[PDB]
Ligand binder design. Structure first.
Ligand code: HEM
Ligand code: HEM
Ligand SMILES: Cc1cc(N)nc(C[C@@H]2CNC[C@@H]2OCCNCC(F)(F)c2cc(F)cc(Cl)c2)c1
Ligand SMILES: Cc1cc(N)nc(C[C@@H]2CNC[C@@H]2OCCNCC(F)(F)c2cc(F)cc(Cl)c2)c1
Ligand SMILES: C[C@H](O)[C@H](O)[C@H]1CNc2nc(N)[nH]c(=O)c2N1
Ligand SMILES: C[C@H](O)[C@H](O)[C@H]1CNc2nc(N)[nH]c(=O)c2N1
Ligand SMILES: [Zn+2]
Lengths: 407, 411
């Protein structure tokens, strides 16, 4: 019931109580651990609402007070009558900040309380969604000085009227499958890029074509908009020592902004809720550039470094991987665009864990996602035991709209 | 029930039915995952089921399930248990058990080799001295002048838990650690407390940076005894770098033979508390963990300091740079000396091929992702992108408490 986590490099031991207030299910049983799997009515709604409003009034040192009871009463009357309810602004802000606080896969949660929340619940059309999103992008980007933000569109109703951003991130490069069999641009986005062109996007057919936004309002068929080019901050990738690096022609965008997730607050579901912070360097330099199914650039870089590529044991992949990452960080830093390296980010997360064990009694963390994809064991998180569990308010992953939607 | 795993790089999907034969618990629940937690006397009553399950597994493997030999063996074990409260494995059963414990070891990336394992039956051993001799033979056989061969030595099983055989060392070969009055450590920090016990037991410590520890061996629940492994049996590799000639001047070496001695082998309910086993190294264990953990030899700074990296900001990735070079050195060194080593690219690709083969032929392969993914270069190895299911099959190896915490000293 009270569980220990031990750090194997420091011997520091933390006691978790927070897990007892664990809402959802992990995917694991007593018989089988699924820790590495990517995807492991009016009745239900009121306990859900009450549970949230209880943590809310608790957080503002007002538990069991008249204002608390009053609100619980009000929301109950609204549900019985309308079959749903509306969050107060303060509740909405608190809930978004907490969905981030509870994101067990996020290493950057030291920043959780600095989240600017944009209430787009009055939005009604795709063009409105677009105006809201351009504003989110410009705000968050801040000429390179990135600020965290989320924009929250209208909540689910009968489920026939959802708002969705069809893009998985607000900003991403196009992918096209080519005559000669290989892939131009980002292979991750081949499918999406095609749905855009079939919806009428005129693709430049390049390698770093910023995709158009595909926006669904009120369960309507989605529409295409180009983000204003001057809003998309991009970074040319060079190396502080390899003059030839620039010649690969690599760029990446400054703003990471996940736009396919579902925000659940007090039982209510915000299906379109694009959010953003800033990059950890390894995301671009390890995953985006080096994943085999991504830009897959290790071979080309290794070659330019003239390494021994004939045997795996010369560790040429490993050498090239590091230089690529040095270059990502160098470039962002030189262009004064916010970026964190895996060392400083994981250091921050350990500090954040300790604060959360101290102040909150725990911190849900998913070790498989928290430990960076290169240099694991030289980051502190590697040696930190973590417990993973599902708390609410939360972000949840949801089916691609094109699977669900009918035209 | 069927369970599917996906590989996110290749989109291959696999179906696990084997988890249905899972016995022990994981530590996880529907409410909590403990997947990153390191550690998440019997009676007759609980023992015959365990014996039965095992012998059923053994008799299936040889295509004799249900045969008279199978039934006679069931009755004979049954009878042995009712009459003595335990039973004795046949050689063939011991071999098969010890092989399947390795096969079922979900934290082992090396398991493609599980079927080629040399089993040494040491169930006739009675004394510590006898234990030493068995262990020297194991080491010489496994080492094989650098052409390493996997092997296990199996000492007598637990009886009443008062007469346990134990190897007090966590591995047969490891370097001493000595904690200094100034708060620094000479040698391996991991081995400090164990070095202390050894010295209290009368070991004459050389007090150098790479002193091979003496075996401390417990037979039949007796107080443990010190033995020096014959140094001509301890193969060691001096560490040098192919391009950097100052690398050798750091003074580093390592032993070639990784040999885990502190684990508990369970077969058909029987508990073998001393079953030292050995394979060969994956380079990252030495290069990443042994040399670069802050709590171990911690050499990252000296290497980067000598490489003249920019060490004033983490974002220069100086630690990452030095880490690669150290790892290049260890593989280069082992290879130049003709000591068996595998790099993590090669070992994880072999593991993926083993894992798929097992799904086809066995119906699954329990694997622990947190352990199988190498401690550097995670995502450029195929295991990173591989969904895995972790569960516990027997026979199995288990962690067991260090013996100096439990031992009743007889004086
Ligand atoms: C401010 C700097 C931030 C950093 C450095 C950061 C870091 C990261 C990283 C490295 C990941 C792993 C993602 C992946 O590998 O795809 C991640 C996942 C995630 N983070 Fe953050 N984060 C930041 C801000 C945010 C914000 C503002 C939110 C939401 C309000 C958020 C919520 C999440 C969620 C929900 C995931 C899991 C996404 C998924 O399952 O695909 N993070 N974070
Ligand atoms: C053939 C060469 C082998 C290689 C390259 C290999 C690879 C590895 C590696 C890299 C680990 C992680 C060790 C750590 O991080 O502490 C490991 C764990 C393990 N291996 Fe192997 N292995 C080999 C042979 C064997 C053999 C012969 C056995 C037993 C018969 C075995 C059973 C285990 C067990 C039980 C673990 C978990 C150890 C623990 O929980 O502390 N392996 N393997
Ligand atoms: C099937 C599936 C499930 C799931 N939960 N996530 C994914 C998305 C997969 C999971 N890792 C790769 C891909 O997403 C990349 C986007 N996520 C993080 C980010 F890059 F956008 C990001 C980074 C950062 F530093 C800050 C923020 Cl706010 C966002 C796929
Ligand atoms: C608390 C705890 C639990 C547990 N199950 N294991 C450990 C042992 C911990 C786990 N990593 C650090 C310490 O291992 C020392 C032995 N390392 C494995 C090996 F070197 F012996 C080895 C490597 C190889 F490739 C092949 C073999 Cl056969 C053996 C500690
Ligand atoms: C907390 C965590 O489980 C612990 O640091 C683990 C992580 N993964 C590991 N993986 C391997 N192969 N060996 C280890 O010692 C560890 N340590
Ligand atoms: C199968 C496995 O879960 C998958 O490869 C995961 C591993 N860890 C990850 N970690 C992060 N941060 N992001 C990811 O996309 C993944 N992918
Ligand atoms: Zn689990």
């Amino acid at each position: 019931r009270f569980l220990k986590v031990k750090n194997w490099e420091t011997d520091v031991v933390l006691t978790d109580t927070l897990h007892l207030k664990s809402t959802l299910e992990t995917g694991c049983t007593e018989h089988i651990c699924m820790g590495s799997i990517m995807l492991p009515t009016k009745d239900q709604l009121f306990p859900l609402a009450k549970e949230f409003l209880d943590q809310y009034y608790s957080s503002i040192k007002r538990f069991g007070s008249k204002a608390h009871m009053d609100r619980l009463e009000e929301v109950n009357k609204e549900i019985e009558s309308t079959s749903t309810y509306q969050l107060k602004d303060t509740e909405l802000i608190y809930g978004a900040k907490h969905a981030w606080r509870n994101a067990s896969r996020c290493v950057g949660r030291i920043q959780w309380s600095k989240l600017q929340v944009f209430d787009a619940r009055d939005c009604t059309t795709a063009h409105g969604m677009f105006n809201y999103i351009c504003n989110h992008v410009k705000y968050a980007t801040n000429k390179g000085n990135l600020r965290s933000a989320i924009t929250i569109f209208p909540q689910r109703t009968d489920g026939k009227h959802d708002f969705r951003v069809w893009n998985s991130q607000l900003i991403r490069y196009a992918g096209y499958k080519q005559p000669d069999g290989s892939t131009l641009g980002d292979p991750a986005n081949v499918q999406f890029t095609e749905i855009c062109i079939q919806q009428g996007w005129k693709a430049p057919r390049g390698r770093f074509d910023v995709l158009p936004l595909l926006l669904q309002a009120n369960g309507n068929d989605p529409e295409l908009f180009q983000i204003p080019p001057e809003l998309v901050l991009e970074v040319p990738i060079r190396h502080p020592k390899f003059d030839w690096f620039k010649d690969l022609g690599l760029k990446w965008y400054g703003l990471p902004a996940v736009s396919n997730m579902l925000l659940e607050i007090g039982g209510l579901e915000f299906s379109a809720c694009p959010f953003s912070g800033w990059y950890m360097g390894t995301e671009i330099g390890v995953r985006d550039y080096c994943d085999n199914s991504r830009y897959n650039i290790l071979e080309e870089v290794a070659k330019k470094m003239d390494l021994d590529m004939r045997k795996t044991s010369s560790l040429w992949k490993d050498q090239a991987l590091v230089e690529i990452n040095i270059a990502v960080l160098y470039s962002f830093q030189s262009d004064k665009v916010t970026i964190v390296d895996h060392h400083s980010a994981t250091e921050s997360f350990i500090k954040h864990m300790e604060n959360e064990y101290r102040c909150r009694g725990g911190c849900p963390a998913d070790w498989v996602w928290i430990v960076p994809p290169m240099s694991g064991s030289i980051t502190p998180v590697f040696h930190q035991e973590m417990l993973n569990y599902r708390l609410t308010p939360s972000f949840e992953y949801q089916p691609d709209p094109w699977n669900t939607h009918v035209w």
